[PDB]
Symmetry: C5
């Protein structure tokens, strides 16, 4: 489903932003 695609991509984005947050510090 399109909304499930959106949720999965947003979860990937959350993971990548967490990685960036911990790469900065």
């Amino acid at each position: 489903d399109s909304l499930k695609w959106i949720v999965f991509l947003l979860f990937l984005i959350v993971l990548l932003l967490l990685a960036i947050v911990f790469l900065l510090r």
Copy 2:
């Protein structure tokens, strides 16, 4: 429904971006 998950993940993304802003500042 997945609108709730979308809003939850967008909220997480806002929090992570604000964290990045404070880390850069």
Copy 3:
């Protein structure tokens, strides 16, 4: 509604990304 809150959060995300670009410039 959920759509309005999604738009609001994406607007916040754009603002935070502008803050990031400004801090990086």
Copy 4:
């Protein structure tokens, strides 16, 4: 509509992330 607003915001986000990439690369 709200879907077009979301598309505009996501496109601006893509452009800003491209700006960040172009800033970090060189």
Copy 5:
């Protein structure tokens, strides 16, 4: 299709965040 545009833009965002992480490391 608007949802297709949303999914594709989020996929591009995932790719760009991947590139950002790769440049940060």
